Design a binder for this molecule. Structure first.
Ligand code: MET
Length: 531
């Protein structure tokens, strides 16, 4: 059943400037999208900003500007950040968009027509900073900005307050048994596994009904009115989660601006999302609430949710206020955009809370990118080794030759599964295992010596090296988008052979293909001094 592969990032609160967390989540989304495009699949990758609610409204009050002016400004900082990061996201959604608003009301009415929204009360704790309803078991003692005793979230450490409001309630309690059926019937639908187990454990215990509206004064009237009740606004989260549905229904022009909202999702063949990339902090919203609303509406459920961890720099939390910053653009200007991406995608898996340091960033840049991949690309394109500047015709293969070829033949299927879990770290590791293999082969065969000694043997060793580098580079292309293009140019791989499942096969580029021209003293990844 073929559709548009639909991958999303979270839409981010616009309370503050964009930082590593957001960049990371969108990078993960971008990579997944990029890979499926490399397979030759239709892709639609979505990211954006969550612009309503109390949090944002009150962040705009601190900075003493209107919410419309505040939100638009910070939204532009996000857009700029993502443009500077050189992503390939298809559309940037904002929850202030008028067409999104329409979809939110449409879904609301569905939930209501279905009998799953009633007038009740919520009386309990709330984290404004997480826009999250909490039970007493999930709060604890803490201190506020003033140094006074207050309550805080066990989840996030932010201040919680007690809310007692007549609210429209969604019947989440009625969806326990169907959510359980769902998790069980689709045991890869939440990644990694231990987070899937977390979600089941939680739903097993039982579900309370969820408040899906608030009194309008409380939100400083910065929200979407509940249909047929102007005294209420729609919960920022029901609003925010609906971005995914909205995005699936927006026809987008070449410039990347929304031009049309279709009545039915089947029209654009995107919904439901094949992968929702999220951080662990927002798992309940995506794994419990979201499916429940979809089941109520009679919409289809997403195929996979992947939830990753939080970053630290130098084993300490990132914060400008604490005296430890991590500026992606800054570190990307210092070491290179692809390199930085590689590091963030390699240093940590989705199970882990990764850690950045200049030390380890250099270790990987020098070690993996320069010595393993860079050195290899330069060797097989060297005028010293590749005397004719072309892909030679291989002679007969030795068993050692074939051992390496097998590794290259098998790499795509292995990488493919990893990109599909998704588990990008393990995909990258897969590829680099093969690059290390090729280097060992090259060191063994000493092709520099073969140029004088055995030219026929050189043709074979050199051909395998080039094809090894080609395949690995193709599979790395979603990770190193700019650098893969430089690599392919050096190898002289024709454009047509740079994507398509076809070109995962060993031997796609024919012998007699000419290398691209050599630039005066160029280097693919320059080694950086050890500090
Ligand atoms: C529908 S995803 C919403 C995520 C939320 N805006 C956040 O930053 O955590």
């Amino acid at each position: 059943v073929e559709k548009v592969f639909f991958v999303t990032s979270p839409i981010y609160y616009v309370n503050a400037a964009p930082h590593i967390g957001h960049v990371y989540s969108t990078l993960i989304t971008d990579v997944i999208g990029r890979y499926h495009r490399v397979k030759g699949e239709r892709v639609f990758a979505l990211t954006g900003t969550d612009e309503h609610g109390q949090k944002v409204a009150e962040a705009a009050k601190q900075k003493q500007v209107s919410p419309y002016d505040f939100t638009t400004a910070v939204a532009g900082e996000f857009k700029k950040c993502f443009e500077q990061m050189d992503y390939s996201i298809d559309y940037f959604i904002r929850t202030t968009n008028e067409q999104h608003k329409a979809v939110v009301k449409e879904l609301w009415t569905k939930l209501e027509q279905k009998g799953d929204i009633y007038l009740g009360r919520y009386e309990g704790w709330y984290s404004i900073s997480d826009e999250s309803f909490l039970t007493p078991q999930n709060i604890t003692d803490g201190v506020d900005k003033d140094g006074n005793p207050c309550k805080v979230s066990l989840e996030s450490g932010h201040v919680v307050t007690w809310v007692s409001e007549e609210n429209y309630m969604f019947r989440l309690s009625a969806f326990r048994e169907r959510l359980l059926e769902w998790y069980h019937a689709n045991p890869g639908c939440i990644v990694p596994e231990f987070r899937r187990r977390e979600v089941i454990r939680a739903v097993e215990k039982g579900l309370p009904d969820l408040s899906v509206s608030r009194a309008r004064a409380t939100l400083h009237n910065w929200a979407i009115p509940v249909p047929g009740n102007p005294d209420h606004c729609v919960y920022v989260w029901l609003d925010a989660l609906t971005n995914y549905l909205t995005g699936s229904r927006l026809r987008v022009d070449e410039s990347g601006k929304e031009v049309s909202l279709v009545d039915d999702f089947n029209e654009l063949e995107r919904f439901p999302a094949d992968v929702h990339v999220i951080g662990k902090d927002i798992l309940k919203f995506h794994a419990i609430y979201w499916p429940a609303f979809l089941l109520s509406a009679g919409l289809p459920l997403p195929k996979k949710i992947v939830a990753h961890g939080w970053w630290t720099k130098d084993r300490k939390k990132i914060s400008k206020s604490l005296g430890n910053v991590f500026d992606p653009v800054e570190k990307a200007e210092e070491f290179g955009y692809d390199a930085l991406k590689y590091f963030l995608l390699r240093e940590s898996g989705f199970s882990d809370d990764g850690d950045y340091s200049d030390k380890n960033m250099i270790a990987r840049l020098n070690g993996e990118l320069a010595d393993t991949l860079g050195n290899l690309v330069m060797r097989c394109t060297s005028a010293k080794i590749n005397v004719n500047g072309e892909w030679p015709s291989p002679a007969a293969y030795t068993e050692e030759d074939e051992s390496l070829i097998q590794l290259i033949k098998d790499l795509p299927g292995t990488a493919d599964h990893y990109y599909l879990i998704p588990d990008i770290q393990k995909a990258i590791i897969a590829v680099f295992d093969v690059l290390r293999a090729i280097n060992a082969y090259v060191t063994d065969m000493a092709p520099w010596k073969l140029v004088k000694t055995d030219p026929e043997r050189l043709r074979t060793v050199l051909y395998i090296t080039l094809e090894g580098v080609r395949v690995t580079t193709l599979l790395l292309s979603p990770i190193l988008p700019r650098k893969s293009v430089v690599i392919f140019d050096m190898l002289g791989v024709p454009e047509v052979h740079r994507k398509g499942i076809e070109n995962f096969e060993f031997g796609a580029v024919p012998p007699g293909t000419r290398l691209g021209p050599a630039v005066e003293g160029e280097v693919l990844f320059s080694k950086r001094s050890t500090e």
